[PDB]
Amino acid sequence: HHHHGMASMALKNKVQLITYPDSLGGNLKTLNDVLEKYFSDVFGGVHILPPFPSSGDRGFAPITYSEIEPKFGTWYDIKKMAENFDILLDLMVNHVSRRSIYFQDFLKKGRKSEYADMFITLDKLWKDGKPVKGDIEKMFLRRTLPYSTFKIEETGEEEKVWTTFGKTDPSEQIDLDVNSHLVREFLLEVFKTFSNFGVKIVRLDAVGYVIKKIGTSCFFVEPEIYEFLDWAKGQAASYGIELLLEVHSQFEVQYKLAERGFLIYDFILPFTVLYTLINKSNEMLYHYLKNRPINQFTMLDCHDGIPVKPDLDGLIDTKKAKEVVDICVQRGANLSLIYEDGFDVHQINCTYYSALNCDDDAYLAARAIQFFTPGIPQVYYVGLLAGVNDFEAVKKTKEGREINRHNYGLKEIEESVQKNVVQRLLKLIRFRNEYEAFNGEFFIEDCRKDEIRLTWKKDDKRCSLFIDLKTYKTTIDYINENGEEVKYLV
């Protein structure tokens, strides 16, 4: 029922960092050093993108969760960080590396492997294990074919298993059968491992894909998906873990998840803030702020691109979606597509600072809007350092999403944090962490279309954001410790 289990939910309301384990100095030890040097009271939590040994997709093809990738560090590095920050880690509920012991044993022994049932051999979907084109055509495909062919060593036979994702063929990412008792035991063991080292929040990667059903899109298949979500939520709670679901879908799916008591990502705000600032109009933002669940993790940038379709379906027309997309692409962006007909832009791959034309004032305005929006605010490491599009990584790797995944060395971090725009952002972050009003009541204030006025109130504390969208001048009027109203020019 409504907001099930949320009576006990009380998350720390402080800004969090999103980073790769190696993108701030090269490993978890340099990450910890950088956090201690510059950011101890800047972040209340850290989402470390997948730090387990992985065979592809920069961490999202995990081989095992029982150790941290040794290039990055050890589980004790995570435990030490958890002493100072809330740690958020990924659970790849949908797939595991083909190089895991589970799948390599299966490729050796075929059906006599004790792990065979962990994987979606095609006989679980079709009587004879033969794919049917008409059925595939109904599916939401994320690669040309949603399966891969492997050779069973002991029999020499060819076997197909489901692989939703994978840039190589065969894919490195083998889908898990979440109906298998063996998979549920496997996932439970990861929760236990995570909990053992202090992890408090777990992101369910690609959770929308876990239910396969012939005749459906195989994306967020109801009601089956909710049986898995309910199971996973209760087991995670047994180990002290809250689940954060990652679902790129139409807003009705996200809203129903929140209505049913699941934490979600705010995948509408990133585009909404871009549109607000590019067009100097608060109308879309105000409509969204008045009609959205508040128990969301907010972001501008993350490790993926800025969502467009399906996340904004029914909320913006193609004209305005294309306006913002085209402007971002003129500013260096590349696009991830749904994959010939219609508007098919899935995400805008672009640093958020570059998307705003490197306009410091507009970028600080964007973060102020984010931090004044109800929800737990997350700052991606590239945006923390006001990073611009990494064209070298795009040209060298031919991977568009690497535009927003630059790896910073220590010396480059030392230089970047001294930039005026970064120092302004750090001051704003600390204000959002320190000022008590953000833990109180939220009010959307009347104002002109080219203004933004948002207020938080708690006890004698109150802070009121004002943005002039004509100039992007961003001011916060707040009550200081002596009860005096003070003006903070962001």
Numbering used by the authors: 7 to 345, 352 to 502
Question: Which sentences did the original study use to describe this structure?
Answer:
Furthermore, the T. thermosaccharolyticum SPP (TtSPP) was shown to accept an even wider range of substrates than the known SPs, offering opportunities for biotechnological applications and further engineering. The IcSPP crystals contained one protein molecule in the asymmetric unit, whereas the TtSPP crystals contained two. IcSPP seems to exist as a monomer, whereas TtSPP in the crystal structure forms dimers. Thus, the dimers observed in the TtSPP crystals probably do not represent a functional state of the protein. Residues that form hydrogen bonds to the glucosyl group are highly conserved, both in sequence and in structure (Asp49, His87, Arg195, His295, Arg399 in TtSPP). The same is evidently true for the catalytic nucleophile and general acid/base at the tips of β-sheets 4 and 5 of the (β/α)8-barrel, and the aspartate that crucially stabilizes the transition state. These catalytic residues are, respectively, found at Asp197, Glu238, and Asp296 in TtSPP. One tetrahedral sulfate ion is present in subsite +1 of TtSPP. It is held by hydrogen bonds with Tyr201, Arg134, and His344. Arg134, Arg195, Tyr201, His344, Gln345, and Arg399 fulfill this role in TtSPP. In TtSPP, on the other hand, a histidine residue is present instead.
Glycoside phosphorylases (GPs) are carbohydrate-active enzymes that catalyze the reversible cleavage of glycosidic bonds using inorganic phosphate. One of the most well-studied GPs in that regard is sucrose phosphorylase (SP; EC 2.4.1.7), which catalyzes the phosphorolysis of sucrose into α-d-glucose 1-phosphate (Glc1P) and d-fructose. Instead, a clear preference for sucrose 6F-phosphate was observed, making it the first sucrose 6F-phosphate phosphorylase (SPP; EC 2.4.1.329) ever reported. Crystal structures of the two SPPs were determined to allow for a comparison of their active site.
